Design an enzyme around this catalytic site. Structure first.
Site, mmCIF file in Angstrom:
data_model
loop_
_atom_site.group_PDB
_atom_site.id
_atom_site.type_symbol
_atom_site.label_atom_id
_atom_site.label_comp_id
_atom_site.label_asym_id
_atom_site.label_seq_id
_atom_site.Cartn_x
_atom_site.Cartn_y
_atom_site.Cartn_z
ATOM 1 N N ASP A 7 0.626 35.635 43.451
ATOM 2 C CA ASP A 7 1.507 35.444 42.305
ATOM 3 C C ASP A 7 2.390 36.680 42.193
ATOM 4 O O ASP A 7 2.035 37.648 41.519
ATOM 5 C CB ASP A 7 0.698 35.214 41.042
ATOM 6 N N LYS A 66 7.163 40.461 39.064
ATOM 7 C CA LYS A 66 6.226 41.414 38.460
ATOM 8 C C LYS A 66 6.684 42.826 38.818
ATOM 9 O O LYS A 66 6.109 43.510 39.668
ATOM 10 C CB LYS A 66 4.800 41.163 38.939
ATOM 11 N N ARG A 119 -0.424 27.803 34.334
ATOM 12 C CA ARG A 119 -0.562 26.661 33.436
ATOM 13 C C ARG A 119 0.201 25.448 33.943
ATOM 14 O O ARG A 119 -0.149 24.315 33.595
ATOM 15 C CB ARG A 119 -0.103 27.026 32.028
ATOM 16 N N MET A 142 -2.376 40.931 42.980
ATOM 17 C CA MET A 142 -2.217 39.512 42.702
ATOM 18 C C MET A 142 -2.779 38.609 43.791
ATOM 19 O O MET A 142 -2.763 37.384 43.622
ATOM 20 C CB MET A 142 -0.746 39.224 42.449
ATOM 21 N N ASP A 147 -5.216 36.000 42.140
ATOM 22 C CA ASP A 147 -4.838 34.918 41.217
ATOM 23 C C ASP A 147 -5.378 33.563 41.634
ATOM 24 O O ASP A 147 -5.012 32.551 41.025
ATOM 25 C CB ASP A 147 -3.316 34.855 41.064
ATOM 26 N N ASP A 171 6.432 33.418 35.948
ATOM 27 C CA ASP A 171 5.117 34.016 36.097
ATOM 28 C C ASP A 171 4.056 33.301 35.278
ATOM 29 O O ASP A 171 2.866 33.556 35.479
ATOM 30 C CB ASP A 171 5.167 35.490 35.710
ATOM 31 N N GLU A 227 3.071 30.464 35.833
ATOM 32 C CA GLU A 227 2.953 29.336 36.742
ATOM 33 C C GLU A 227 1.560 28.731 36.746
ATOM 34 O O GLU A 227 1.418 27.548 37.075
ATOM 35 C CB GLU A 227 3.339 29.767 38.159
HETATM 36 ZN ZN ZN Z 1 1.711 34.236 37.013
HETATM 37 ZN ZN ZN Z 2 -0.548 33.798 37.959
#
Ligand code: ZN
Ligand code: ZN
Ligand code: ZN
Ligand code: ZN
Ligand code: ZN
Ligand code: ZN
Lengths: 511, 518, 519
Positions: free
Chosen positions: A288, A295, A372, A305, A308, A368, A370
């Site tokens: 991510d 980010k 959900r 990340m 994730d 970011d 993403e």
């Molecule tokens: Zn994210």
């Molecule tokens: Zn994420």
């Protein structure tokens, strides 16, 4: 199935070790009454001093050995305190003129130890093992611990002891003796600890795997290979199947990736009558970057990340434990909409309006957020199975570091009984979870001006709850809980994953 | 007792309106089983239609006037729905051939209306009052409502209707005309009457607290805030003591006094006391964070989003406790002793301020390494807690705008509650339910305490590594309650109503309900 | 003398001010270019342009009265040099009297009507030839066309840029600075430009004076010392002066102005210089200048990157402009006018005594104000300074202030912005801009933003919470403090300081003076 590459050196599979040194450890549990033997290896007593904060060390158990007994005399054990986590250990000759090692681990001044205290104790224990080349360790329990906490002590010693060298390039013990009161009742927990240990260590292996190694293609391949080794049904959904299903939200996140979206669906079905159907959904974002919402802010920890997909890793480790233990009278579905969130000419962008697989349109406010989006279609898919319980687990919102911090996961849900079962499973797995509310008053901030719903709140800062209200819109008539592990998943101090959720999720399936 | 000033134009007291226009409102509750008389003013019907989202409106109550009835015939009301918050105005000539005003407010499609939904109805109701010059408002309850929801209705109506003009000079809002009578038509009116007085006392206690919060920092300072409490105590006939610097020095309150070392207003410690004229079964101590302005100190609030301009509210905890003192002092409960405490100061930047890295000694001997001068709330509350404990009480409850993390944990709607005692938290949780001021229980993760181990002092003011700020502060406060039941209510996120730009008075009804149902 | 407080005995107690500058000793002679240029001692420089082609060749048109110098300046011999704006060359030769002379040129481009910006660049090239050369006379020959106002601008700009301010140099004085004593000018129709020489000299010092004030740092130039500075100025110019201290300011209920100063170690001081002409008075004018001797920001400290807190000794440039104006007016003596020069001086500081964000304060007109940000302290002081201004009963109120940093994002460092409630007054300001050659540009007071000043508790918000166009919103705020008088407001925040040369511009002195001598 074939993992795409940019150069010939890009790795094409996740290295997995299934047969670890832990599995070769012979574990014997002796009853504390009748005394202890100190005939070889490292013998460690777990002693506390209730009340007397930082009090001296006193060893109660009688050791069948004149010399070590002389060492453990109160007059000599006085110079040492019970400061939780403190430790010392000495080498000497015993009755039979054999070199042995005797010591203690301080269990503090409290009687009912918590999971974190236990963890601190184990950490001292493993610290002695890693700097002492012995073949036997013996642990005498002069503290009170229930069956679950005992099993937890074994799992944690196993997991912390195992050192992951898969990515390194340029001697564990063979016996474990446990002296404890009531040994006979505690014995049935040892082999279960061994299973939970690996289930936890498997998840850690996937999480720890970097995103070049652990991508959507290779991660689905590992899932399939785990299903076959475990003899579970397995169906992997590809882009064509995913378009036919209309999972717009999930596919948008992957649009910018060089790895096609891969949806994992493992199924364990017990042999007898099925009395409970359960869907477990895990966030599976193998990297991510944030997407066009890069980010880039200080503290955003883009370099972490690779983790994730921690939810997916937990749900898979659960499959190992569930398939290995083979419980009765359940049908468990292990789901994860895997993908990778990248910046490309092809990515979805902030402001895009996309259509989930249930027809609701969603306005993207931040790329970011993403996780959900992918969970939205996974939850639609899961409800189509006609299950009784949908439990998802995800590294969803960094806000959890400011609510519960790095020890406690947060759980949200739409059903009181399901949240109750998850909490009780937290009590028996010793994986801490805390119930947080889905505050209805905040729902109006997801009222999109153009789409059917906003992806994010523009004003409200309690993002952990907002996401929860978004997810709720994708479960119509099924008990559903949501476990945000963003803050607890990664052990920042030890620089390694925790494997959080495996044992919590398994206990939920088992009891 | 005298408020220092820099220029003669600096105010020397908080303006406080005790007799408010809401107080001048004559309220009567009439039994609906007897018809509704539609003589004068605006008379409003609260209607719902369980079923479809926006069902139609249907008047059920017997209207005691032929013309109005003929007007309120279903055939006429079919065009309008009951969407929660909807309303409409009607004009007609009644049986006496007079002009009357009537209307409705949609109460949605739910049978048992929610608290949050009740508020939305009151706001919609208040909107009908604001640009209208009316002498009487009549409300007929055609919806299911328990006593507690009736009081909460009155309560909320009073607070939203009340407009705070204490600081207007040339922008005094002309056309402002408060109603003089309030009529309520409800079933079993005889049972809801008991709540009118209570909705009034609870209303003012909250608006009182809101007046102290809204009062700018130049007006509301430690000297003038303690002066205000002494006047309140004198009206209510409460015992009162104000500890000044020399007494606080003698009590060895290093943490509390260190925060105010940089202020131009000396520290003032509020201690009001209520006890009833019978046997005492429960003794409570209520502690409120009383920082009249919080600049952060040398850890200045200069980062973006630190809202330094809002920090006149950093005494909402004190306001809640004084607010509770009014409700308790008015209703006078039996068999209780209640101390209302607050260590008031101002966190300023000066050559006299304390510095980060400073090491200070609290009134209980514990040395403290200050890590961030803007974590001053936990410092003042530390000395107030040891003070409270010395009183020999059964319950110590503190309420504070302590940590901004609250916005990320529970948001702007729910206060967090922490404590060392399940029983007291449960009583706070119950009180949260009945005062209708929502609160959620958060835990004191013991695993974080180790990040408070200072290398030189006895304890760290702040954690360096952990970010769960609300939880860590609760762990710090925990070290200054040795053996008493103690809970902690963090209201940093709920105190200020950002959409309306006005305090909520959060905590007044919660604390009162805690005191009265014991 | 009114005593300046000190922390240590070394703290300065006065602003050092030079009134007799080397530019006051240069004798200026203006000659008509018809009838010949003589090439005396020192340096002789031609201002030459070539309409049409850029970087075109330089040709010396005027008649020189020397065979040798004529032969040296033959067109065939000059073609090797172009006229690119700013270029310059030095020549050396012997004249008719077998004496060495020095001549040269400065290029003025190919455009016909040069702007003030172009004139600035031509003058900068001249000064470059004056520095590091011990010259006793400079002579400039105008082979270019300039109206009377632009010709004055040339003299003033020359004088201003030539001057070097060494007040605060101790061990690092330029021991090589030697100013010329004589300045010749050759120009067509010279008799008409002669009248501008004395005005240019006056305009130079007026601007250089404000410059001295602005560059004086906040420990030298504080509210007490700067008001003392104005007193002396009024005294040298026989101007009326009254300095209002805290006691009267409290009597006058100036709560907004006083709040900003509550946190300073120097008490507030309100400057009021008055010039009344002896004739029948036809126009009464009040000029108001923002007088913040240092703007730390207050509790809204200037800590954000690029906040340039180290520059904030300049938050009194408006007051300096207005005092610089007072010098010109006091010196030139317009005949039928009454001029009030006002400045509410104070210092915005962090202390236990400072006003806080959120504080609600009452202005001298009884309106209460909610302080949303202490760094917007200028509009607070000006609010009270405007109320005081209308009470005097004048025809025009014009304030000048380094008010909003937005100015750098709207008009930049060259043009100031003018706002007001009166088209005619705004036109007079725009007219004075043309004649002073100090660029101003009219910006709107957009009334739609008024609603965002609606405080929930006070009478008015000090700052908008949503609107980002700070320079407009402050204008809306000030407009609430002038009830029935033509008023304009000139934001010089962007144009006051010359970042490139690291010195103040003195911007506004000449703009304001021209306005004072307006029809
Ligand atoms: Zn994210
Ligand atoms: Zn994420
Ligand atoms: Zn603070
Ligand atoms: Zn604070
Ligand atoms: Zn400023
Ligand atoms: Zn300023």
């Amino acid at each position: 199935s074939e993992v795409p590459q940019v150069v010939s050196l890009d790795p094409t599979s996740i290295p997995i070790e299934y047969n670890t040194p832990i599995h070769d450890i012979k574990v014997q549990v002796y009853d504390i009454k009748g005394g202890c033997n100190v005939e070889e290896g490292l013998t460690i007593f777990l002693v506390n001093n209730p009340g007397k904060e930082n009090g001296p060390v006193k060893i109660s158990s009688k050791v069948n050995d004149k010399q070590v007994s002389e060492f453990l005399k109160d007059e000599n054990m006085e110079k040492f305190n019970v400061k939780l986590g403190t430790s010392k250990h000495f080498y000497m000759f015993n009755d039979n003129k054999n070199s042995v090692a005797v010591g203690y681990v301080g269990c503090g001044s409290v009687a009912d130890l918590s999971e974190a205290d236990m963890k601190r104790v184990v950490l001292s224990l493993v610290t002695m093992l890693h700097d002492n080349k012995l073949s036997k360790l013996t642990v005498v329990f002069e503290i009170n611990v229930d069956k679950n906490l005992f099993r937890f002590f074994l799992e944690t010693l196993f997991y912390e002891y195992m050192t992951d060298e898969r990515f390194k390039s340029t001697e564990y013990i063979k016996h474990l003796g446990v002296y404890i009161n009531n040994a006979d009742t505690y014995k049935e927990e040892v082999e279960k600890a061994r299973v939970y240990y690996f289930g936890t260590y498997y998840a850690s292996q996937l999480i720890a795997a970097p995103s070049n190694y652990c991508n959507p293609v290779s991660l689905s391949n590992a899932a399939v290979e785990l299903a076959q080794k475990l003899n579970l049904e397995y169906k992997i959904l590809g882009v064509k199947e995913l378009e036919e299903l209309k999972m717009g939200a999930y596919l948008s996140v992957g649009k910018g990736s060089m790895y096609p979206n891969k949806f994992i669906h493992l199924t364990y079905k017990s042999k007898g009558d099925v009395k409970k159907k359960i869907a477990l959904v895990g966030k599976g974002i193998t990297f991510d970057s944030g997407g066009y919402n890069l980010k880039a802010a200080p503290g955003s920890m883009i370099d972490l990340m690779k983790f994730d997909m921690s939810g997916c890793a937990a749900v898979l480790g659960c499959a190992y434990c569930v398939g290995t233990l083979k419980p009765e009278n359940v049908e468990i579905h292990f789901l994860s909409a895997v993908c990778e969130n990248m910046v490309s000419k092809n990515s979805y962008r902030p402001g895009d309006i996309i259509t989930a697989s249930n027809g609701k349109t969603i306005e993207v406010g931040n790329t970011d957020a993403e996780g959900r989006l992918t969970l939205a279609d996974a939850l639609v898919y899961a409800e189509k199975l006609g299950v009784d319980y949908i439990v998802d687990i995800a590294t969803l919102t960094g806000a959890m570091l400011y609510s519960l911090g790095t020890s406690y996961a947060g759980v949200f849900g739409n059903n009181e009984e399901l949240i109750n079962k998850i909490l009780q499973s937290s009590k028996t797995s010793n994986e801490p979870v805390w119930w947080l509310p889905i505050i209805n008053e905040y729902r109006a901030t997801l009222n999109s001006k153009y789409a059917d719903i906003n992806q994010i709140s523009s004003s409200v800062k309690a993002s952990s709850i907002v996401a929860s209200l978004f997810l709720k819109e994708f479960v119509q008539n099924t008990a559903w809980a949501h476990i945000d592990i963003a803050g607890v998943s990664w052990n920042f101090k030890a620089r390694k994953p925790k494997g959080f959720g495996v044992r919590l999720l398994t206990e939920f399936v088992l009891n």
